[PDB]
RNA sequence: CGCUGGGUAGCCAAGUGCGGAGCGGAUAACUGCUGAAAGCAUCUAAGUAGUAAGCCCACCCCAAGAUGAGUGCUCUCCUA
Protein backbone atom coordinates (compact mmCIF):
# COMPACT_ATOMS: atom_id res chain seq x y z
CA UNK A 1 0.00 0.00 0.00
CA UNK A 2 0.93 3.68 0.34
CA UNK A 3 2.15 3.51 3.94
CA UNK A 4 4.84 0.87 3.31
CA UNK A 5 7.18 2.80 1.01
CA UNK A 6 10.62 4.26 1.83
CA UNK A 7 10.98 8.02 1.46
CA UNK A 8 13.24 8.39 -1.58
CA UNK A 9 15.54 11.21 -0.46
CA UNK A 10 17.81 12.38 -3.33
CA UNK A 11 21.19 14.10 -3.14
CA UNK A 12 21.66 17.48 -1.39
CA UNK A 13 18.42 17.01 0.57
CA UNK A 14 19.11 17.33 4.29
CA UNK A 15 16.72 15.45 6.59
CA UNK A 16 16.07 17.20 9.91
CA UNK A 17 14.02 15.15 12.39
CA UNK A 18 12.72 17.08 15.42
CA UNK A 19 10.34 16.48 18.31
CA UNK A 20 6.92 15.96 16.69
CA UNK A 21 8.11 17.89 13.62
CA UNK A 22 9.84 17.35 10.27
CA UNK A 23 12.22 20.05 9.03
CA UNK A 24 13.46 19.15 5.57
CA UNK A 25 16.25 21.27 4.07
CA UNK A 26 16.26 21.06 0.29
CA UNK A 27 18.09 23.41 -2.08
CA UNK A 28 14.84 25.22 -3.01
CA UNK A 29 13.32 25.80 0.43
CA UNK A 30 12.81 24.42 3.95
CA UNK A 31 9.32 22.96 4.36
CA UNK A 32 8.13 22.25 7.90
CA UNK A 33 5.33 19.86 8.91
CA UNK A 34 4.23 18.85 12.43
CA UNK A 35 3.89 15.10 13.04
CA UNK A 36 0.42 13.65 13.75
CA UNK A 37 -0.49 12.46 17.23
CA UNK A 38 -0.36 8.78 16.15
CA UNK A 39 2.65 8.64 13.78
CA UNK A 40 6.25 8.15 14.93
CA UNK A 41 8.94 8.15 12.24
CA UNK A 42 12.14 6.09 12.01
CA UNK A 43 15.32 6.44 9.97
CA UNK A 44 17.87 3.83 8.89
CA UNK A 45 21.03 5.98 8.67
CA UNK A 46 20.55 6.93 5.01
CA UNK A 47 18.20 8.80 2.69
CA UNK A 48 15.24 6.54 3.49
CA UNK A 49 12.66 7.64 6.06
CA UNK A 50 9.84 5.38 7.25
CA UNK A 51 6.77 6.71 9.02
CA UNK A 52 5.32 4.21 11.48
CA UNK A 53 2.04 3.92 13.35
CA UNK A 54 2.10 4.54 17.10
CA UNK A 55 -1.17 2.81 18.09
CA UNK A 56 -3.34 0.10 16.53
CA UNK A 57 -6.33 2.15 15.37
CA UNK A 58 -8.12 3.31 12.24
CA UNK A 59 -7.05 6.97 12.36
CA UNK A 60 -3.38 5.94 12.36
CA UNK A 61 -4.19 3.95 9.22
CA UNK A 62 -5.66 7.17 7.78
CA UNK A 63 -2.72 9.45 8.59
CA UNK A 64 -0.22 6.65 7.98
CA UNK A 65 -0.71 6.66 4.21
CA UNK A 66 -1.76 10.33 4.30
CA UNK A 67 1.35 11.41 6.19
CA UNK A 68 3.48 9.02 4.12
CA UNK A 69 2.62 10.66 0.81
CA UNK A 70 2.64 14.12 2.42
CA UNK A 71 6.26 13.59 3.47
CA UNK A 72 6.84 12.29 -0.06
CA UNK A 73 5.50 15.65 -1.25
CA UNK A 74 7.83 17.33 1.26
CA UNK A 75 11.02 15.68 -0.02
CA UNK A 76 10.07 15.74 -3.71
CA UNK A 77 8.66 19.23 -3.12
CA UNK A 78 11.87 20.75 -1.76
CA UNK A 79 14.18 18.70 -4.02
CA UNK A 80 12.71 19.10 -7.52
CA UNK A 81 9.56 21.20 -7.06
CA UNK A 82 6.14 20.93 -8.65
CA UNK A 83 4.84 22.74 -11.72
CA UNK A 84 1.33 23.15 -13.12
CA UNK A 85 0.62 23.79 -16.81
CA UNK A 86 -2.44 26.00 -17.20
CA UNK A 87 -3.74 27.07 -20.60
CA UNK A 88 -6.06 29.90 -21.63
CA UNK A 89 -8.16 28.52 -24.48
CA UNK A 90 -9.54 30.89 -27.10
CA UNK A 91 -9.09 34.35 -28.57
CA UNK A 92 -8.53 37.39 -26.36
CA UNK A 93 -7.77 35.25 -23.29
CA UNK A 94 -4.30 36.70 -22.80
CA UNK A 95 -2.21 36.35 -19.64
CA UNK A 96 0.91 38.30 -18.74
CA UNK A 97 3.01 39.43 -15.79
CA UNK A 98 3.12 42.71 -13.84
CA UNK A 99 6.32 42.15 -11.87
CA UNK A 100 4.67 41.44 -8.54
CA UNK A 101 1.23 40.64 -9.97
CA UNK A 102 -0.26 38.66 -12.85
CA UNK A 103 -2.95 40.10 -15.12
CA UNK A 104 -5.55 38.01 -16.96
CA UNK A 105 -7.60 39.42 -19.83
CA UNK A 106 -10.42 36.86 -19.78
CA UNK A 107 -13.21 38.57 -21.73
CA UNK A 108 -14.43 40.58 -18.74
CA UNK A 109 -14.80 44.35 -18.50
CA UNK A 110 -11.49 44.70 -16.66
CA UNK A 111 -8.65 42.15 -16.72
CA UNK A 112 -8.16 40.40 -13.39
CA UNK A 113 -5.12 41.67 -11.48
CA UNK A 114 -4.41 38.54 -9.43
CA UNK A 115 -1.37 38.61 -7.15
CA UNK A 116 1.10 35.73 -7.32
CA UNK A 117 2.80 34.89 -4.00
CA UNK A 118 6.53 34.97 -3.33
CA UNK A 119 6.86 31.18 -3.06
CA UNK A 120 5.67 30.54 -6.63
CA UNK A 121 7.69 31.36 -9.74
CA UNK A 122 5.20 31.55 -12.59
CA UNK A 123 6.17 32.00 -16.22
CA UNK A 124 4.30 32.82 -19.42
CA UNK A 125 6.47 31.36 -22.18
CA UNK A 126 3.58 31.67 -24.65
CA UNK A 127 0.69 34.15 -24.31
CA UNK A 128 -2.00 31.53 -23.58
CA UNK A 129 -0.43 28.79 -21.45
CA UNK A 130 0.91 29.67 -17.99
CA UNK A 131 3.40 27.50 -16.09
CA UNK A 132 2.83 27.96 -12.35
CA UNK A 133 6.06 26.77 -10.72
CA UNK A 134 6.56 26.24 -7.02
CA UNK A 135 7.99 24.19 -4.18
CA UNK A 136 4.99 22.63 -2.43
CA UNK A 137 2.24 20.94 -4.43
CA UNK A 138 -0.64 22.31 -2.33
CA UNK A 139 0.19 25.98 -2.94
CA UNK A 140 0.62 25.34 -6.69
CA UNK A 141 -2.73 23.54 -6.72
CA UNK A 142 -4.54 26.21 -4.70
CA UNK A 143 -3.24 29.12 -6.77
CA UNK A 144 -3.72 27.15 -10.00
CA UNK A 145 -7.31 26.47 -8.94
CA UNK A 146 -7.62 30.16 -8.03
CA UNK A 147 -6.63 31.18 -11.57
CA UNK A 148 -8.91 28.36 -12.79
CA UNK A 149 -11.84 29.68 -10.68
CA UNK A 150 -12.60 32.57 -13.09
CA UNK A 151 -13.34 30.95 -16.48
CA UNK A 152 -13.78 27.18 -16.40
CA UNK A 153 -14.11 25.59 -19.86
CA UNK A 154 -17.80 25.56 -20.76
CA UNK A 155 -18.89 22.67 -23.03
CA UNK A 156 -20.76 24.65 -25.70
CA UNK A 157 -18.19 27.44 -25.59
CA UNK A 158 -15.23 25.04 -25.65
CA UNK A 159 -13.19 27.98 -24.44
CA UNK A 160 -11.85 28.80 -20.98
CA UNK A 161 -8.88 28.13 -18.67
CA UNK A 162 -7.97 24.44 -18.61
CA UNK A 163 -4.74 22.62 -17.84
CA UNK A 164 -2.89 20.29 -20.19
CA UNK A 165 -4.15 16.76 -21.17
CA UNK A 166 -7.23 16.86 -18.95
CA UNK A 167 -10.36 15.68 -20.75
CA UNK A 168 -13.10 18.33 -20.96
CA UNK A 169 -16.77 17.64 -21.66
CA UNK A 170 -17.97 19.30 -24.86
CA UNK A 171 -21.39 19.52 -26.51
CA UNK A 172 -22.48 20.03 -30.11
CA UNK A 173 -25.49 22.37 -30.00
C1' C B 1 -63.53 83.65 12.78
C1' G B 2 -70.52 86.47 9.73
C1' C B 3 -68.76 85.15 4.69
C1' U B 4 -64.54 85.82 1.86
C1' G B 5 -58.90 87.68 0.23
C1' G B 6 -53.95 86.83 1.46
C1' G B 7 -49.83 85.87 5.66
C1' U B 8 -44.99 86.07 9.79
C1' A B 9 -43.42 82.63 13.79
C1' G B 10 -45.17 77.28 14.94
C1' C B 11 -46.99 72.29 12.91
C1' C B 12 -47.04 69.62 8.27
C1' A B 13 -45.90 67.55 3.09
C1' A B 14 -46.95 67.53 -1.77
C1' G B 15 -41.56 70.60 -0.41
C1' U B 16 -36.34 70.29 1.07
C1' G B 17 -31.51 67.35 2.72
C1' C B 18 -29.55 62.51 4.12
C1' G B 19 -29.25 57.10 4.62
C1' G B 20 -29.04 51.82 3.23
C1' A B 21 -21.20 51.25 3.70
C1' G B 22 -17.51 47.13 4.50
C1' C B 23 -10.49 42.36 -0.47
C1' G B 24 -14.67 43.06 7.70
C1' G B 25 -15.19 37.40 10.52
C1' A B 26 -17.32 32.52 10.21
C1' U B 27 -20.55 29.60 7.45
C1' A B 28 -25.40 26.84 4.44
C1' A B 29 -25.77 24.88 -0.94
C1' C B 30 -21.69 24.41 -4.40
C1' U B 31 -16.70 24.62 -6.96
C1' G B 32 -12.11 23.18 -5.32
C1' C B 33 -6.35 22.19 -3.52
C1' U B 34 -3.17 18.54 -1.87
C1' G B 35 -5.18 13.45 0.03
C1' A B 36 -5.44 8.47 2.48
C1' A B 37 -9.41 3.58 4.52
C1' A B 38 -9.34 -0.72 -0.80
C1' G B 39 -0.30 1.22 -4.07
C1' C B 40 -6.54 3.75 -9.16
C1' A B 41 -9.64 7.35 -7.30
C1' U B 42 -12.51 10.72 -4.30
C1' C B 43 -13.90 18.60 -1.72
C1' U B 44 -12.15 15.29 3.92
C1' A B 45 -11.12 11.10 7.14
C1' A B 46 -5.49 15.48 8.81
C1' G B 47 -4.95 20.51 7.12
C1' U B 48 -6.90 24.34 3.79
C1' A B 49 -8.97 28.04 -0.34
C1' G B 50 -13.40 31.24 -3.16
C1' U B 51 -18.45 32.36 -1.66
C1' A B 52 -25.20 34.03 -0.24
C1' A B 53 -29.91 40.08 0.27
C1' G B 54 -28.70 34.57 5.18
C1' C B 55 -25.60 34.77 10.92
C1' C B 56 -22.28 38.09 13.68
C1' C B 57 -19.55 42.60 13.79
C1' A B 58 -19.16 47.51 11.83
C1' C B 59 -23.78 51.57 10.97
C1' C B 60 -27.84 55.40 14.19
C1' C B 61 -30.05 55.90 19.09
C1' C B 62 -31.14 54.32 24.29
C1' A B 63 -28.08 51.95 27.65
C1' A B 64 -24.02 49.92 34.82
C1' G B 65 -31.56 48.65 38.49
C1' A B 66 -25.52 44.89 33.51
C1' U B 67 -27.72 44.23 41.98
C1' G B 68 -22.08 41.50 37.74
C1' A B 69 -24.94 48.17 39.92
C1' G B 70 -18.48 49.84 35.69
C1' U B 71 -14.19 53.40 34.56
C1' G B 72 -11.94 58.49 34.54
C1' C B 73 -11.68 63.79 36.32
C1' U B 74 -13.17 67.21 40.06
C1' C B 75 -15.69 69.47 44.80
C1' U B 76 -16.80 68.93 50.32
C1' C B 77 -16.78 66.93 55.47
C1' C B 78 -15.68 72.18 59.78
C1' U B 79 -16.58 74.65 65.81
C1' A B 80 -17.59 72.95 70.68
UniProtKB/Swiss-Prot annotation:
Q: Does the keyword rRNA-binding apply?
A: yes
Keyword DNA damage listed: no
Q: Which GO terms describe its molecular function?
A: rRNA binding; structural constituent of ribosome
Keywords for this protein: Chloroplast, Plastid, Ribonucleoprotein, Ribosomal protein, RNA-binding, rRNA-binding, Transit peptide
Q: Which GO terms describe its biological process?
A: translation
Q: What is its main location?
A: plastid
GO CC aspect terms: chloroplast; ribonucleoprotein complex; ribosome
Annotated compartments: Plastid, Chloroplast
Q: Which domain of life is it from?
A: Eukaryota
Q: Which family does it belong to?
A: Belongs to the universal ribosomal protein uL6 family.
Role description: Component of the chloroplast ribosome (chloro-ribosome), a dedicated translation machinery responsible for the synthesis of chloroplast genome-encoded proteins, including proteins of the transcription and translation machinery and components of the photosynthetic apparatus.
Q: How does it assemble?
A: Component of the chloroplast large ribosomal subunit (LSU). Mature 70S chloroplast ribosomes of higher plants consist of a small (30S) and a large (50S) subunit. The 30S small subunit contains 1 molecule of ribosomal RNA (16S rRNA) and 24 different proteins. The 50S large subunit contains 3 rRNA molecules (23S, 5S and 4.5S rRNA) and 33 different proteins.
Q: What is this protein called?
A: Large ribosomal subunit protein uL6c
Instruction: Tell me the classification of the organism that encodes this protein.
Output: Eukaryota, Viridiplantae, Streptophyta, Embryophyta, Tracheophyta
Amino acid sequence: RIGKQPITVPANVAIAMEGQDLKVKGPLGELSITYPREVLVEKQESGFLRVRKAVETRRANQMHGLFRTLTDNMVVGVSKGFEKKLQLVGVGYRATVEGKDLILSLGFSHPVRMAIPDELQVKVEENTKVTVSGRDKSVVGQFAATIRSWRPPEPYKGKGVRYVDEVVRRKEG
